Amino acid sequence: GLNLIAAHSHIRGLGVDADTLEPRPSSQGLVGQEKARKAAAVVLEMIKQGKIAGRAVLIAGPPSTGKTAIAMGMAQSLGQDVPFTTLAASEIFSLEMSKTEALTQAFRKSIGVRIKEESEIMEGEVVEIQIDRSTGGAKQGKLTIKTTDMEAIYDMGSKMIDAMTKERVMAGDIISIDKSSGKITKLGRSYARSRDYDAMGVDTKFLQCPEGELQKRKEVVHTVSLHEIDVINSRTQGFLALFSGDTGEIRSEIRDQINTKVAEWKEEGKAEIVPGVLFIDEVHMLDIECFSYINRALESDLAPIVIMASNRGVSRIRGTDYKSPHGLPLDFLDRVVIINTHPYTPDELRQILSIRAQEEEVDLTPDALALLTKIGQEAGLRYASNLITTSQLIAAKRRAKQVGVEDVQRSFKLFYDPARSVRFVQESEKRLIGNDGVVDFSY
Amino acid sequence: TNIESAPSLAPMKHYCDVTGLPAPYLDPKTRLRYHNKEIFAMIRNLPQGMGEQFLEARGAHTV
Numbered sequence: 134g135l136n137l138i139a140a141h142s143h144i145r146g147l148g149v150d151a152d153t154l155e156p157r158p159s160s161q162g163l164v165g166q167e168k169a170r171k172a173a174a175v176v177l178e179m180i181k182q183g184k185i186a187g188r189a190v191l192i193a194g195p196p197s198t199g200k201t202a203i204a205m206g207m208a209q210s211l212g213q214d215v216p217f218t219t220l221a222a223s224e225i226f227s228l229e230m231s232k233t234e235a236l237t238q239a240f241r242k243s244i245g246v247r248i249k250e251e252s253e254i255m256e257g258e259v260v261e262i263q264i265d266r267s268t269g270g271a272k273q274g275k276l277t278i279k280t281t282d283m284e285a286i287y288d289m290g291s292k293m294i295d296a297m298t299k300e301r302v303m304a305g306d307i308i309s310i311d312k313s314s315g316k317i318t319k320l321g322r323s324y325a326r327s328r329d330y331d332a333m334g335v336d337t338k339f340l341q342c343p344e345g346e347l348q349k350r351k352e353v354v355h356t357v358s359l360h361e362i363d364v365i366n367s368r369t370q371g372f373l374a375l376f377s378g379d380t381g382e383i384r385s386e387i388r389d390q391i392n393t394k395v396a397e398w399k400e401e402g403k404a405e406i407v408p409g410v411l412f413i414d415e416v417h418m419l420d421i422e423c424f425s426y427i428n429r430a431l432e433s434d435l436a437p438i439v440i441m442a443s444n445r446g447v448s449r450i451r452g453t454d455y456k457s458p459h460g461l462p463l464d465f466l467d468r469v470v471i472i473n474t475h476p477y478t479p480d481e482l483r484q485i486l487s488i489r490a491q492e493e494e495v496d497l498t499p500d501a502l503a504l505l506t507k508i509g510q511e512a513g514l515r516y517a518s519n520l521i522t523t524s525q526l527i528a529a530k531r532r533a534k535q536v537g538v539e540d541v542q543r544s545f546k547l548f549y550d551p552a553r554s555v556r557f558v559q560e561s562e563k564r565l566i567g568n569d570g571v572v573d574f575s576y
Numbered sequence: 577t578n579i580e581s582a583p584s585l586a587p588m589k590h591y592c593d594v595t596g597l598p599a600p601y602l603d604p605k606t607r608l609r610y611h612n613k614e615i616f617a618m619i620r621n622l623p624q625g626m627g628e629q630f631l632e633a634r635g636a637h638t639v
């Protein structure tokens with residue numbers, strides 16, 4: 134389909150026993166990281182429980198230790214029930230809006246308003262449309278519709294006859310009509326009428342007739358974020374800015390009104406509030422102004438849980454000239470609990486490579502998996518994982534059905550790991566342009 | 577002087593000719609109004625003379 138194979142495609146969940154929060158040694162595509170997966174499952178529990186507002190969790194650990202994987206596992210194990218916003222900290226440096234406004238919109242995106250509504254929908258195969266069009270139009274007309282179980286005829290009001298002519302509704306068309314709006318969606322063409330569709334090309338699909346009653350109440354559970362309500366109220370087609378962007382800085386008094394109205398809908402029981410998650414990937418790309426805003430945004434009642442990942446050690450905080458752990462100011466780190474991801478053992482690398490060799494269509498011979506595991510220890514999990522794809526392409530060039538050691542060796546030879554790449558750089562320092570701008574082009 | 581009868585201009589509600597429950601549907605074939613698919617099944621299975629009796633109970637006739 135349109136989803137290709139990607140680095141996280143094998144993550145199907147968090148891999149944790151829902152009855153106990155005990156992490157299984159591997160399941161759902163996660164291997165090891167058990168203590169970190171247990172902690173993320175405790176966070177996941179209190180996300181679903183909703184009662185706790187504006188807690189922040191940092192996932193801290195060396196690169197490739199599964200920090201994004203655990204974040205993706207939580208997203209896959211929340212699903213559609215809960216809003217889940219992913220933010221790269223690079224994204225808030227907008228030219229359209231100040232970074233605290235961009236960071237406000239991200240918090241607003243992570244609270245859902247859940248609204249349950251009904252409508253009568255009429256659905257069936259058109260047996261006939263008669264419209265007289267009697268000079269003017271839409272004067273009178275009759276609609277006959279059937280399911281497999283019923284047939285009925287309807288006199289149409291003139292603004293429904295406009296809708297029918299607008300949708301060029303024809304005998305044999307399978308339609309749904311939302312009655313209160315009066316919009317007509319043509320779900321398809323009935324197969325029994327196929328010969329009447331003389332203009333439709335042979336690529337055309339056909340359907341069986343709808344089943345049961347022509348009319349029923351269908352109930353829709355909408356979830357709309359606070360950000361969407363904010364943007365809708367900004368201007369006469371405010372929602373249109375939810376797509377193009379081109380929201381300005383939305384005025385604070387609009388948000389304050391909406392917070393009051395959503396509290397009214399909750400107290401009236403018309404709507405429910407569904408707190409989600411905001412995940413801030415590589416949070417150390419934020420600067421000191423951002424962290425000062427976050428500190429108090431977290432104290433709002435309508436704050437999501439915020440989950441964060443950092444590769445950084447004791448490192449320079451952006452927008453200042455001093456250093457702190459994770460690159461995050463201590464006053465912000467006081468508001469945050471930290472989950473640590475550790476490096477992998479060789480057998481866990483073997484399992485992750487095996488999983489990645491299942492997610493791509495690759496057969497690894499047992500010695501090729503052993504060699505990739507050895508390369509994984511020596512050159513890192515990500516590099517060996519990229520040798521899987523490379524080896525399959527080399528094997529296919531030699532038309533082999535399984536990837537052999539010869540293919541992994543060609544991969545290791547053709548594509549350098551980060552350390553050999555650095556060693557190549559440290560040898561070529563006269564040919565590579567230095568930090569001084571100096572370079573020699575002679576042989 | 578027997579000129580005391582009065583017509584009505586308001587749109588009338590639709591009731592099932594069999595069960596008298598409200599009727600969303602008018603059957604194009606037999607022209608009985610009916611409540612649901614269960615009653616449509618009966619209506620199409622009726623003895624041939626019976627359909628005209630359900631019409632006639634509300635003063636309607638097919639011809």
Ligand SMILES: Nc1ncnc2c1ncn2[C@@H]1O[C@H](COP(=O)(O)OP(=O)(O)O)[C@@H](O)[C@H]1O
Nearest residue numbers: 140141162163164166196197198199200201202
């Ligand atoms: N415990 C694990 N189980 C399964 N796959 C993992 C695990 N840890 C890392 N990976 C995979 O290895 C790759 C690198 O890990 P990643 O989560 O990107 O690390 P980080 O985000 O800390 O750099 C990703 O494709 C990820 O899916």
